[PDB]
Design a protein around this ligand. Structure first.
Ligand SMILES: *[C@@H]1O[C@H](CO)[C@@H](O[C@@H]2O[C@H](CO)[C@@H](O[C@@H]3O[C@H](CO[C@H]4O[C@H](CO)[C@@H](O)[C@H](O)[C@@H]4O)[C@@H](O)[C@H](O[C@H]4O[C@H](CO)[C@@H](O)[C@H](O)[C@@H]4O)[C@@H]3O)[C@H](O)[C@H]2NC(C)=O)[C@H](O)[C@H]1NC(C)=O
Ligand SMILES: *[C@@H]1O[C@H](CO)[C@@H](O[C@@H]2O[C@H](CO)[C@@H](O[C@@H]3O[C@H](CO[C@H]4O[C@H](CO)[C@@H](O)[C@H](O)[C@@H]4O)[C@@H](O)[C@H](O[C@H]4O[C@H](CO)[C@@H](O)[C@H](O)[C@@H]4O)[C@@H]3O)[C@H](O)[C@H]2NC(C)=O)[C@H](O)[C@H]1NC(C)=O
Ligand SMILES: *[C@@H]1O[C@H](CO)[C@@H](O[C@@H]2O[C@H](CO)[C@@H](O[C@@H]3O[C@H](CO)[C@@H](O)[C@H](O[C@H]4O[C@H](CO)[C@@H](O)[C@H](O)[C@@H]4O)[C@@H]3O)[C@H](O)[C@H]2NC(C)=O)[C@H](O)[C@H]1NC(C)=O
Ligand code: 7O2
Ligand SMILES: *[C@@H]1O[C@H](CO)[C@@H](O[C@@H]2O[C@H](CO)[C@@H](O[C@@H]3O[C@H](CO)[C@@H](O)[C@H](O)[C@@H]3O)[C@H](O)[C@H]2NC(C)=O)[C@H](O)[C@H]1NC(C)=O
Ligand SMILES: *[C@@H]1O[C@H](CO)[C@@H](O[C@@H]2O[C@H](CO)[C@@H](O[C@@H]3O[C@H](CO)[C@@H](O)[C@H](O)[C@@H]3O)[C@H](O)[C@H]2NC(C)=O)[C@H](O)[C@H]1NC(C)=O
Ligand SMILES: *[C@@H]1O[C@H](CO)[C@@H](O[C@@H]2O[C@H](CO)[C@@H](O[C@@H]3O[C@H](CO)[C@@H](O)[C@H](O)[C@@H]3O)[C@H](O)[C@H]2NC(C)=O)[C@H](O)[C@H]1NC(C)=O
Ligand SMILES: *[C@@H]1O[C@H](CO)[C@@H](O[C@@H]2O[C@H](CO)[C@@H](O)[C@H](O)[C@H]2NC(C)=O)[C@H](O)[C@H]1NC(C)=O
Ligand SMILES: *[C@@H]1O[C@H](CO)[C@@H](O[C@@H]2O[C@H](CO)[C@@H](O)[C@H](O)[C@H]2NC(C)=O)[C@H](O)[C@H]1NC(C)=O
Ligand SMILES: *[C@@H]1O[C@H](CO)[C@@H](O[C@@H]2O[C@H](CO)[C@@H](O)[C@H](O)[C@H]2NC(C)=O)[C@H](O)[C@H]1NC(C)=O
Ligand SMILES: *[C@@H]1O[C@H](CO)[C@@H](O[C@@H]2O[C@H](CO)[C@@H](O)[C@H](O)[C@H]2NC(C)=O)[C@H](O)[C@H]1NC(C)=O
Ligand code: NAG
Ligand code: NAG
Ligand code: NAG
Ligand code: NAG
Ligand code: BR
Ligand code: BR
Ligand code: BR
Ligand code: BR
Ligand code: BR
Ligand code: BR
Ligand code: BR
Ligand code: BR
Ligand code: BR
Ligand code: BR
Ligand code: BR
Ligand code: BR
Ligand code: BR
Ligand code: ZN
Length: 870
């Protein structure tokens, strides 16, 4: 490319840093263009002739350069290097160390039609009037497409934003609006206060018609914004935000430093949310809430995501990673605080179940060979994007969970408060976090050397346990399936002596192996309590047998988390090969006596995975026998379920999980009950309320008919609750009619009836069942370039689409097909982690069948199929 561009690396030089930006913009939402002026106050730290900077998609009309002393307005030369998104201003005289200069760039651009950058869209009223909207989504690398800037997290500065807007529209930004000035035509010029020192990826602005619901919290004005038709649905978000804000301010011991806090429901938005200082943005479906149209799950989603964005105000905004290799310092911490804060002041939501489920999934991902270390180098935009995955979020927060469990809660909070004070308005890398722990630790434990392997090595240990009399023999090794270094592991363990008293302790495995002294003789022992540790445990056969026998005798000597753990671990170990798959089904035979959600949903997960693998291979009979077996196992919990909203949140989640399992596979007469409810709902023009906990199920069953499908579509394009629309959309995309499934995907990719923000979800849903299995993948291939135009390589959305439409493939023939497809895209695309993980998941699918197919075929030989065999 550009050997004639005065910079080669992807990280900007350190020679010049920005102090202040004054950015004034004139967006035209109608024509979808904008004109701009950016003034950048910089300082040189070394002698240099070049200012290297970021800019993309900018038609640059004038570039002036002012020596601060000299105050005369020069012209300066400009070079471009599109590959790295970089531009270079070559200076008339050399920049001297410690001198100040002002850089002014005038330019015009397009308002983006993706979800990335400064983007804009139109939506439709209840009034059937067309409305326009513009919003920013900059993280990680899009700020540079709205304005020239030093677009790297470590270059923090202050921003003065100016927006020209039509009088009817409201403009928002990070800071409070300082003033307005009326302009010719129906135009207003807005000016926002100078911001605090922050990263460019956090700059945000919004132009559109909105209303607000507000409340004072001790000098901070908290406001929820939404389009006027929706403003009735923001009361729960406001009440929640106020609670979590007080909580976080008490815990961190550092006040939120802005005079305003805005939370905005954006009509069209790809992420779940974004933490821009003072102007947090959300999908409508993740911030709006109505008790009568939104399920329990929907309420949890809104509480969780608000906790998450609020936590970012400290971890991410106040304190920020130096570079994307340490993204987990943001996202791990924010995820940890999300689930921590809910357990403190929303304990009734049982959000710990979600945390637990997400970790199960992150481990399966982490166990692959195409995993990276959680802190790993990123040297391209694709790798930067790829950091936004479940490792950085859920492994990062489970590292912290391990650490908090092992030290104390108070020792943890002390470390945290030191950390945020010491690095306020500044940048960090992994070592600073361990340093802050070391200061509180009293060098009793060297936390830096304890966390070394956890942060720099991929994967996690398999811990093997064998009871030799009154002592546990213990080993660690890399967990992975084939086709290094030691962890410092906090081994917790709980146990029951011969006299039925329970003892629990903690030791720390530093070496390859160790012995634990048990003090007594024990009936059973369970390692890794509540899965507070990020590893999997394998027992010797005698010791598996003891836990499996105790579950059959009285499962409640362990927690629901403990029993969920065991179910997960034994299935992942039967997949590797360390135990026969039969052993896993022995362990879940106790489920007839299980009343907690977490172990039941974890078993329902493994069952469905296996079911869906067999179904796509065409082993229909065998797959029906499998869910019949599991159905008989849970027959009593399933049959005692009511079709209501009664019970604790957790019990409400169990109802949904159980009824959904029975209706999907046509077991019992749940289908009949659901259809009766749908017909009565449909014949009442959606008036006779459906209990929010059974809607998805009822809608799925109705959508299996033309008459019902059409009627649901009619509701989707017209009702005002985005929560209900989402349950409807899931039903539509569960139709067995291929023409309809094709229409849903094509419509969403174009906008039209469904927004493109629903596309990954629609494709996910279509690819999961048999009629749409081949259709989703084909859709992804044929529209591959249009997808990448809307969602760059290799962002979260694309990795979601690739994974969700390939992970149920289990033959060599599909493996070759998927591989060949990506190799014809480009060698760069085929070498993406996204692609490599998909190829690896398929290979594992293939090995899984060749190990367990004949086993499963034998175990189920007497069970009754539901389908006729071919
Ligand atoms: C099955 O159930 C669905 C509900 O899902 C019903 O759909 C509703 O149908 C009604 C009646 O057609 C719709 O009401 C109409 O809304 C329009 C938009 O209203 C907005 O804009 C006005 C000003 O523009 C605001 O005042 C208002 O508060 C909203 O912000 C109105 O413009 C329409 O008004 C015109 O017609 C009525 C006569 O019906 C006159 O009184 C008015 O003065 C004016 O002439 C009208 O009010 C409503 O939008 C639909 N809701 C949804 C969610 O789609 C179906 O009607 C129902 N089917 C059957 C057979 O009953
Ligand atoms: C309701 O609202 C009020 C105001 O918003 C809150 O009261 C404020 O509490 C904060 C934090 O506790 C105070 O800000 C801090 O004051 C501490 C001391 O500053 C005083 O003392 C110094 C000592 O030199 C005096 O010179 C000075 O005049 C101040 O009056 C500081 O130690 C604080 O810590 C640090 O500042 C930043 C904050 O993170 C760090 O980077 C530094 O390391 C430094 O240590 C901070 O400056 C504030 O002054 C209080 N206001 C009032 C009016 O008392 C309530 O806490 C709040 N209640 C809620 C939210 O529940
Ligand atoms: C971007 O460029 C577009 C043109 O490509 C330009 O579009 C026009 O914007 C104005 C916005 O002010 C619109 O004018 C309105 O017209 C309606 C009638 O359709 C009026 O009701 C509007 O409101 C009031 O006018 C005064 C207050 O503004 C009041 O005295 C009066 O009582 C009304 O309440 C307003 O006059 C016009 O419709 C559009 N045209 C198109 C084709 O979209 C837009 O202004 C440019 N934006 C920027 C920021 O440069
Ligand atoms: N949900 C999303 O699409 C993205 C991407 C993602 C998805 C899964 C795992 C990791 C990351 N995440 C976000 O929007 C989370 C919330 C989400 C979530 C929280 C924890 C773990 C996983 C997801 C969420 C969703 C529902 C309820 C509560 C929180 C919001 P954020 O503030 O992190 C923001 N920094 C993401 C910016 C971004 C997103 C995707 C691509 C590029 C840039
Ligand atoms: C280059 O420009 C930067 C700012 O763009 C200069 O740094 C800062 O300059 C201001 C002076 O205006 C210092 O702020 C303070 O003023 C307020 C009164 O409002 C008071 O609170 C402070 O005690 C200080 O007087 C600021 O601290 C300063 N920062 C640094 C690191 O120096 C910088 O001086 C300029 N360099 C030049 C012109 O060589
Ligand atoms: C605020 O955080 C800074 C980091 O910006 C802390 O400075 C760091 O202090 C730790 C000690 O706790 C240093 O660790 C030591 O480094 C030496 C140098 O190689 C090493 O040989 C030792 O074994 C030990 O690990 C760390 O290097 C240092 N880092 C930097 C960048 O200075 C500082 O302690 C914190 N301040 C407060 C008041 O807590
Ligand atoms: C789910 O099912 C389990 C087992 O059916 C329930 O655990 C049972 O809980 C009751 C009361 O919570 C226990 O009875 C009590 O035992 C303690 C200790 O001996 C004593 O202090 C009380 O006076 C009473 O006797 C019972 O032992 C326990 N069963 C087992 C096997 O541990 C659990 O409550 C159910 N959960 C829900 C949400 O329904
Ligand atoms: C980039 O924008 C510039 C102006 O900002 C466009 O150049 C011309 O503008 C002058 C007046 O400033 C007119 O004399 C010309 O008519 C404009 N150009 C044309 C082709 O009409 C320039 O065209 C834009 N560049 C690109 C590549 O679109
Ligand atoms: C919407 O926001 C405004 C502030 O932006 C809220 O009320 C304001 O209160 C302050 C102080 O009393 C005043 O500076 C503003 O003039 C007030 N605005 C209005 C419109 O009254 C207002 O309450 C918020 N709306 C809702 C429904 O909460
Ligand atoms: C059950 O037996 C255990 C040991 O076999 C008893 O626990 C020990 O009690 C002694 C004192 O009697 C303590 O010094 C030990 O520390 C205890 N062991 C542990 C592991 O804590 C226990 O008291 C007995 N309980 C009953 C109800 O019989
Ligand atoms: C059709 O399904 C419903 C499930 O809701 C059956 O009603 C329940 O039946 C089981 C088993 O007899 C009981 O344990 C439940 O308590 C019943 N009612 C509830 C939970 O409300 C119904 O009996 C089924 N149809 C037939 C013919 O048996
Ligand atoms: C905006 O998009 C149009 C589409 O063809 C293009 O011609 C124009 O040059 C673009 N402006 C930019 C990239 O600044
Ligand atoms: C939802 O329903 C309950 C009772 O059915 C009611 O008290 C509540 O007000 C309803 N929610 C709204 C927003 O009306
Ligand atoms: C696993 O990936 C590493 C790079 O992390 C690579 O060197 C190695 O060849 C791969 N091994 C297998 C078995 O896939
Ligand atoms: C284990 O601990 C018990 C009591 O705590 C002690 O009597 C016993 O000797 C210990 N075993 C070993 C091998 O140290
Ligand atoms: Br301007
Ligand atoms: Br109107
Ligand atoms: Br972009
Ligand atoms: Br927690
Ligand atoms: Br790096
Ligand atoms: Br880059
Ligand atoms: Br522990
Ligand atoms: Br049933
Ligand atoms: Br259609
Ligand atoms: Br068509
Ligand atoms: Br599998
Ligand atoms: Br048998
Ligand atoms: Br078959
Ligand atoms: Zn986050």
């Amino acid at each position: 490319n550009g050997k004639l561009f005065p910079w080669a690396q992807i990280r900007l030089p350190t020679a010049v840093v920005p102090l202040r930006y004054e950015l004034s913009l004139h967006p035209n939402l109608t024509s979808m263009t904008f004109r701009g002026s950016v003034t950048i106050s910089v300082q040189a730290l070394q002698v240099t002739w070049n200012i290297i900077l970021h800019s993309t998609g900018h038609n640059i009309s004038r570039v002036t350069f002012m020596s601060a002393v000299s105050s005369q307005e020069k012209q300066a030369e400009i070079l471009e290097y599109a590959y790295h998104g970089q531009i270079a201003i070559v200076a008339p005289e050399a920049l001297l160390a410690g001198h100040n200069y002002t850089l002014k760039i005038e330019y015009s651009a397009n308002i983006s039609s993706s979800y990335y950058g400064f983007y804009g869209f139109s939506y439709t009223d209840e009034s059937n009037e067309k409305k326009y909207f513009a919003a920013t989504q900059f993280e990680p690398l899009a700020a540079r497409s709205a304005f020239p800037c030093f677009d790297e997290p470590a270059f923090k500065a202050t921003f003065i934003i100016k927006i020209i807007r039509d009088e009817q529209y409201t403009a928002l930004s990070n800071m409070p609006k300082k003033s307005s000035v009326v302009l010719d035509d129906g135009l207003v010029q807005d000016e926002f206060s100078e911001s605090v020192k922050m990263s460019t990826y956090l700059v945000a602005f919004i132009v559109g018609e909105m209303k607000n619901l507000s409340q004072d919290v001790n000098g901070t004005l908290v406001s929820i914004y939404a389009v006027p038709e929706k403003i009735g649905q923001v009361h729960y978000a406001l009440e929640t935000t106020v609670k979590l804000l007080e909580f976080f301010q008490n815990y961190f011991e550092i006040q939120y430093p802005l005079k305003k806090l805005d939370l905005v429901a954006i009509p069209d938005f790809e992420a779940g949310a974004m933490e821009n200082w003072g102007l947090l943005t959300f999908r409508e479906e993740t911030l709006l809430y109505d008790s009568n149209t939104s399920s329990m799950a929907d309420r949890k989603l809104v509480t969780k995501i608000i906790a998450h964005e609020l936590a970012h105000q400290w971890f991410g905004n106040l304190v920020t990673m130096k570079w994307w290799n340490d993204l987990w310092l943001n996202e791990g911490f924010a995820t940890f605080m999300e689930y921590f804060s809910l357990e403190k002041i929303f304990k009734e939501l049982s959000s710990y179940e979600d945390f637990l489920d997400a970790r199960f999934k992150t481990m399966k991902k982490d166990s692959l060979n195409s995993s990276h270390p959680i802190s790993s180098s990123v040297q391209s935009s694709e790798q930067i994007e790829e950091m936004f995955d479940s490792l950085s979020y859920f492994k990062g927060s489970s590292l912290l969970l391990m650490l908090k469990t092992y030290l104390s809660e108070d020792v943890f909070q002390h470390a945290v408060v030191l950390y945020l004070h010491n690095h306020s308005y500044a940048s960090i890398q992994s070592d600073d976090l361990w340093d802050s722990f070391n200061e509180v630790t009293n060098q009793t434990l060297d936390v830096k050397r304890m966390m070394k392997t956890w942060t720099l090595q991929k994967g996690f240990p398999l811990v093997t346990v064998q009871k030799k009399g009154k002592e546990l023999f213990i080993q660690q090794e890399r967990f992975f399936l084939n086709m290094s270094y030691l962890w410092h592991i906090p081994l917790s363990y709980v146990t029951e002596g011969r006299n039925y008293s329970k003892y629990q302790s903690v030791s720390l495995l530093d070496k390859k192996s160790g012995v634990i002294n048990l003090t007594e003789e024990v009936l059973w022992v369970k390692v890794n309590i509540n899965m507070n540790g990020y590893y999997i445990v394998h027992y010797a056969d005698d010791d598996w047998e003891a836990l499996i026998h105790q579950l059959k005798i009285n499962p409640y000597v362990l927690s629901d988390k403990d029993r969920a753990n065991l179910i997960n671990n034994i299935f992942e170990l039967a997949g590797l090969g360390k135990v026969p798959l039969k052993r896993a089904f022995d362990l879940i035979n106790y489920l007839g006596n299980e009343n907690h959600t977490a172990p039941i949903t974890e078993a329902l997960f493994q069952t469905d995975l296996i079911y869906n693998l067999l179904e796509k291979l065409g082993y229909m009979d065998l797959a029906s026998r499998l869910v019949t077996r599991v159905f008989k196992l849970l027959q009593n919990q399933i049959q005692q379920q009511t079709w209501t909203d009664e019970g604790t949140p957790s019990m409400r989640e169990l109802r949904s999980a159980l009824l959904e399992f029975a209706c999907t596979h046509n077991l019992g007469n749940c289908s009949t009950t659901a259809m009766k409810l749908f017909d009565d709902w449909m014949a009442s023009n959606g008036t006779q309320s459906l209990p929010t906990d059974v809607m998805t199920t009822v809608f799925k069953v109705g959508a299996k008919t033309d008459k019902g499908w059409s009627f649901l579509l009619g509701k989707y394009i017209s009702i005002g609750s985005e929560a209900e629309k989402n349950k409807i959309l899931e039903a539509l995309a569960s139709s067995e009619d291929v023409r309809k499934l094709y229409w849903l995907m094509k419509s969403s990719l174009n906008g039209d009836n469904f927004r493109t923000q629903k596309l990954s979800f629609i494709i996910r849903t279509v690819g999961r069942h048999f009629p749409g299995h081949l259709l989703a993948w084909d859709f992804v291939k044929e529209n591959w370039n249009k997808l990448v135009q809307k969602f760059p390589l290799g962002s979260y959305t694309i990795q979601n689409i690739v994974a969700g439409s390939t992970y149920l493939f289990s033959t060599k023939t599909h493996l070759s097909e998927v591989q060949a497809f990506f190799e014809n895209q480009s060698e760069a695309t085929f070498r993406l982690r996204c692609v490599q993980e998909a190829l690896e998941v398929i290979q594992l699918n293939i090995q899984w069948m060749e190990k367990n197919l004949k086993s499963l075929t034998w175990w189920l030989r007497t069970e009754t199929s539901q389908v006729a065999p071919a």
